Amino acid sequence: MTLETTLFPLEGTGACGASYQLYAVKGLSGLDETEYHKNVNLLVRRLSFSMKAPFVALSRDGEQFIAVPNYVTEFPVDHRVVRAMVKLVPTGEPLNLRFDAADDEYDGLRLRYLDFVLQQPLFANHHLWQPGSGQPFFHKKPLKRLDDVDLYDGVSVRAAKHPEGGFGIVCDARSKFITHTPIGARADRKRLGKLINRSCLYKMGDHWYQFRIDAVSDWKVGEPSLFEGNVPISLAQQLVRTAGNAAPKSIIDLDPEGGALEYFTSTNERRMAPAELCFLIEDTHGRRAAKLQRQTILSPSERRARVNGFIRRYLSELNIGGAKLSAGARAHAFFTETHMPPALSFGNGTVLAPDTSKDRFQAMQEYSSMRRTMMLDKKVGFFHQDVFPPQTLLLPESVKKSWGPAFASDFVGTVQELYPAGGYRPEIIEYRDKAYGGGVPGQMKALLEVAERGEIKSGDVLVMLHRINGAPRAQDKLAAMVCNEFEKRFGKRVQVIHSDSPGRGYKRIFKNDKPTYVQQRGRGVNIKGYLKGAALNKVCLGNSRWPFVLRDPLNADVTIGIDVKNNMAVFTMVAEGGRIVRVQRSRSRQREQLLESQVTQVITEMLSKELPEIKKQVQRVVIHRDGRAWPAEIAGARKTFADMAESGLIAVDADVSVFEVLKSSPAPLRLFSFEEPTQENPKGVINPVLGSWLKLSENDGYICTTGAPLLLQGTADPLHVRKAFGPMAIEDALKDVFDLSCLTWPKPDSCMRLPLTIKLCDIALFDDA
DNA sequence: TTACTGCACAGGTGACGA
Numbered sequence: 001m002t003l004e005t006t007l008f009p010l011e012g013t014g015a016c017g018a019s020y021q022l023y024a025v026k027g028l029s030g031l032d033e034t035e036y037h038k039n040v041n042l043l044v045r046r047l048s049f050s051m052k053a054p055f056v057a058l059s060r061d062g063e064q065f066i067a068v069p070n071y072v073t074e075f076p077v078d079h080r081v082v083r084a085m086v087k088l089v090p091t092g093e094p095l096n097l098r099f100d101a102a103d104d105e106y107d108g109l110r111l112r113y114l115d116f117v118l119q120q121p122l123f124a125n126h127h128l129w130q131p132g133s134g135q136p137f138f139h140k141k142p143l144k145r146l147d148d149v150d151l152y153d154g155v156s157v158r159a160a161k162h163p164e165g166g167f168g169i170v171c172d173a174r175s176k177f178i179t180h181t182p183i184g185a186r187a188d189r190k191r192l193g194k195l196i197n198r199s200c201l202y203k204m205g206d207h208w209y210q211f212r213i214d215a216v217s218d219w220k221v222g223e224p225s226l227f228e229g230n231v232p233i234s235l236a237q238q239l240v241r242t243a244g245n246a247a248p249k250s251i252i253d254l255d256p257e258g259g260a261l262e263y264f265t266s267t268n269e270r271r272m273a274p275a276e277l278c279f280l281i282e283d284t285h286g287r288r289a290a291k292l293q294r295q296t297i298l299s300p301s302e303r304r305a306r307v308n309g310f311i312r313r314y315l316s317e318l319n320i321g322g323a324k325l326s327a328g329a330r331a332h333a334f335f336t337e338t339h340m341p342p343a344l345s346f347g348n349g350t351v352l353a354p355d356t357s358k359d360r361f362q363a364m365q366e367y368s369s370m371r372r373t374m375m376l377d378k379k380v381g382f383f384h385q386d387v388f389p390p391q392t393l394l395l396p397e398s399v400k401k402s403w404g405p406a407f408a409s410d411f412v413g414t415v416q417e418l419y420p421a422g423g424y425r426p427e428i429i430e431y432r433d434k435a436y437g438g439g440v441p442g443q444m445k446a447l448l449e450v451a452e453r454g455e456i457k458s459g460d461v462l463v464m465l466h467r468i469n470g471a472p473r474a475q476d477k478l479a480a481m482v483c484n485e486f487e488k489r490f491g492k493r494v495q496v497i498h499s500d501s502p503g504r505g506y507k508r509i510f511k512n513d514k515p516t517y518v519q520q521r522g523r524g525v526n527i528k529g530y531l532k533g534a535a536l537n538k539v540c541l542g543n544s545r546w547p548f549v550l551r552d553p554l555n556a557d558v559t560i561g562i563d564v565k566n567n568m569a570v571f572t573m574v575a576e577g578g579r580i581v582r583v584q585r586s587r588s589r590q591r592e593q594l595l596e597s598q599v600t601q602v603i604t605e606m607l608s609k610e611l612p613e614i615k616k617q618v619q620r621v622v623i624h625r626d627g628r629a630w631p632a633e634i635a636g637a638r639k640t641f642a643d644m645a646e647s648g649l650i651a652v653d654a655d656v657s658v659f660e661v662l663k664s665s666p667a668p669l670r671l672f673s674f675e676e677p678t679q680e681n682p683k684g685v686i687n688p689v690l691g692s693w694l695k696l697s698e699n700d701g702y703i704c705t706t707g708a709p710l711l712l713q714g715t716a717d718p719l720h721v722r723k724a725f726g727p728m729a730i731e732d733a734l735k736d737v738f739d740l741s742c743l744t745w746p747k748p749d750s751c752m753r754l755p756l757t758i759k760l761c762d763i764a765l766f767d768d769a
Numbered sequence: 770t771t772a773c774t775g776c777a778c779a780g781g782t783g784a785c786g787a
Contacts, residue, residue, distance in 0.1 A: 041782060041783095044782065044783090045781095045782075045783060048782085048783055048784075049783070049784070049785095051784095052784045052785060053784080054783095054784090055782090055783095056782075057782070108782090112782080115783095116783095116784080119784085120784095120785095123784085123785075130785095132783090132784090132785095133783055133784050133785070134781085134782095134783055134784095174776090175775075175776070176776075176777095177776080197778095199777085199778090202786080202787095204786060204787080205786095207785090207786050208786090209785085209786060211786095225787090226787070235787060238787055239787070242786085242787080260787085262787095263787090265786090266783075266784080266785090269787095270787090271786085271787045272787050273786095273787065274787090281776095281777085282776095283776070283777060283778080284775080284776060284777085285775080285776055285777065285778090286776095286777080286778090293774095293775060293776080294774090294775085295775095296774085296775050296776065297773095297774050297775055298774090298775090473777075473778065497770075498770095501770075502770095525770095529770080529771090530770055530771095531770085532770080532771095533770035533771050534770045534771090535770085536770080536771085537770055537771065538770075592780095628781095628782095666781095666782090706772090706773060706774085710772085710773085711773060711774075712772095712773070712774080713773080713774060714773070714774035714775070715774080716773085716774085717773085717774075717775090744772080746770080746771055746772075747770085747771045747772045749772090750771080750772040750773080751772070751773070752772065752773085753772090753773070
């Protein structure tokens, strides 16, 4: 119940002045509403970088109004490029914003100013450095040396509203891996060329920052490559005359034969840096270094200690102009109620309820384990139990000729034990995986040829693919193409598994004077665990056999997720308790945004199909957007339900609310709870329990969809959800985000960070050609 | 096959810097 945040109060913010002059923009009156705001923030960005001041957008009614810090003297007022030229006309009457007010619509302006100015004292601190604007502040001294690489520890700092009045800071600890020795003056042109698109740390004397390698310079560090006025000058000479005071040796004594890297400014200009002073950023996710990556996962005690250390060390005096500022010693804390997980419905009339006579941790551990054990028990089992329609299992020819048959026997038996009512009995087909080439073309050619001959009877196909890209941070192009083509050209619905994972589960054995494949249980995969998980996710869930659903209504009757990435929009709908659930794809104009018409079409048709199955009059609707929400999207959403309320398909006074689910949060906040201090945990800091939550304002809140009993390591990352429109209170939306995240269908005995709504999108999220 | 913890890559309402 006792919970603490990483929100620190701000002190001395009396006598703080945020002077803006509003302007407004003509441009062309073609408010494309999808091209309009694009250009709005393109110009805001351009001005913020060129003039280096905190330009903001405040969008009232017309949604124009760039806000210009009044302390810039010469202002272009007219701005070129950006399609038709834009004229900036002031709305007179300068603003002088203060931090002791009630809730205004100028709060975005204050937060922008506060963010901008809080990072001058840290930018000036000799012992800190920042990769780039907005990013966290890391110590120059590494936290640790791991062999060839250094582990740097930093803290991110964002301004925010304080729920007990005023403004504060939300911070989080952060990590970065950088190779210890530099690229070096002795590295030749071929080596540097092989580094294009890596990022590196540049120790330009006392000023450290990070940039993306874009090309290799033709001129060496000592050869003339610049102009000082009209005299051609070397990079060495330029770095010398921009050093000051007692400049370090490294910047004034470069090897003249060393090479230089090239990069782009934020304002899009060309610059050089000597390789002698650049240290490659290391990717611990790619080139999968488990031992290194584990160093970045912090216990709650480690996290709290590092965050508070940074606060007390660098945020106790903070001078900005005549301004004296401080960060409170101790973070905001509260007593809160924690949400209980919802009662769930399983097969045969059985309900699972959290037990309230146990302490919250034990009760949550029992409930989570029970989700799996009730799914498996043939006396209770899946909430939705029916026979499957015909099924196909489509295997590569090379697999069918070796270990395919043994895998299929085991998989079929595993499905029948997990879901005894389906009578799973797939027809096994092969495709010629070696006949054409084994890139994405050629695999696709063999899959399509098998589909053309009519060999895939039935509409459900489970297809085993080869893994073309084994590197992480890689989308499965082949799987996306297979789903898209089998849906578009045939009626097929396709789930995917790969060949590497199960193949590691089987070894060839001599039995009865015959070669046979049998299970091997050493290492590389846990084959039983694989068979069970793939049976659940690819066959049961893939045929929409939900193992359990909510017993009680959410605050929302219907709730709809949206994600647009790769010109591939995904709409999702959960209704009743998760008894309805649908998922549609759509080809969007842009890669990551939606036209208002497309929204108001897909949603209307999708919901009209299901409305006769929704046996309660519908009156509250919620949309969960995965990421930023655009107002063309909001307009379409409001229009859909105003129309359906007029018609009578819905309650005449039904309402809509829209919420962005920010999984990477721009203001990352953490929650801690406390136990009795043990010898290992001298302060007794621990994770918050699963249902914990907090709202900072009417528009910003946090739920722990992950938390204490079910996390094995690290500290929980609370989920940030922010309202964008509508009458639903933020607390109610937090509660049923949490209830929707207890529908842990992919892995019943575990916690799950995203609510089921957006969980559907980010797995069905695919590619377009 | 799947769950979280993590960084980064891009990819961003974003100030620096040869």
